[PDB]
Amino acid sequence: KRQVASGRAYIHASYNNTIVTITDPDGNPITWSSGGVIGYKGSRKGTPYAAQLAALDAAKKAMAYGMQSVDVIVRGTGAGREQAIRALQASGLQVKSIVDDTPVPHNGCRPKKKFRKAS
Template identity: 50%
Template sequence: MAEETNKEGKPSTGRKVAEENPEAEAAEAETAHVLSADEKLSEARKTEKETAADLLKDDLGELKIRRAKGSKNITQGVCNVLATFNNTKVTFTDLKGNVISWASGGKCNFRGSRKSTAYASQVVTQTAGRVAMSHGLKEVIIKVRGPGMGRDSAVRAIQALGLTINAIIDTTPVPHNGCRPKKRRRA
């Protein structure tokens, strides 16, 4: 089967040359104009999405901590993390035990079984930590209590905030065979 060639001897692409059909050229230009308008719209949408994503990246990247009104100007403190099976509570105090800030799963709008997740623990710790940092907190001793899933994620969230961790202490109460435990689950 013989291939068609154009004037230069190259294989033809199947399009008619504009010199042969001026009406086809006008129709092609019109469709190109319509396509370019559609392409412009799609590109504009892409750039809008990219800019929104860029804004989110910038927002999550750098923490902007503002000084709180009536800030206590405390540089060292204690972070008490209570991680139960149902919830996670985080309290930042000064070295004497006076509360600087606190947060819990319910305070951060988690309800029901979501309160007991590791993600909820991370959000709770970040919320309380930002308020504590606005009061000038820079160094912290972490006291972790309880068997919940939020223990590790709370410590990681404090590291991510940029607080200096001086010590991590596990203060989970261990009985010397005191109270009778709850009945075993039949799962």
Template identity: 50%
Template sequence: MARQTKRVSSRKVKRKVPKGVVHIQATYNNTIITITDLQGEVLSWSSSGSCGFKGRKKRTPFASQTAAESAIRRSMDQGLRQAEIMMSGPGPGRDMALRAIKTSGLGVSLVRDVTPVPHNGCRPPKKRRL
């Protein structure tokens, strides 16, 4: 009995996406930039760590600028021209990433801060007694 195997194409399909969403997640230790289309499917992503920065250098504004330029370059190859920007987190690289996106030639239609803010959140821990 001969077993038939399926042939699966492993080539990525380049699609033309004129409008998308840039998600910037800036933590204290790293900056992650993800570019999606309007349905939420990822077109490209980059982070300070994936650009070759290690340790304390990942948190610098220059590292986040490099990550933003890398992600934008890859998504503009897929036809991205206009984008909305969603920023999240308190990290030091968020402003520099935004500046890098604006100077890259990508049209920015909206900048929104989507950092989660607690509405009185969790109960704080007990006071320390010494």
């Protein structure tokens, strides 16, 4: 319904699901695909093959909206972000440059009890 040709890919990479959101040169997204879109409702939700599949799905979706040029933003390290990256590279997609941006706080609030003991 929309279209833009140039743009970004965002990979939020958590434990439980490797989420891929694909977006325009401004910042408003076109489509997003997850492990739970193509099955995978569980622990295997957060799994490298699953992530790869999700990425592929996202790419396909992008291709339907007439999308060519893609810049890569990895946000974090969930289990298969590398796999996802590889998939993206593969898809016959105009894969530009690879960029890693962490939402690591510059020591902010003391987190939950599963990031605790790691101080």
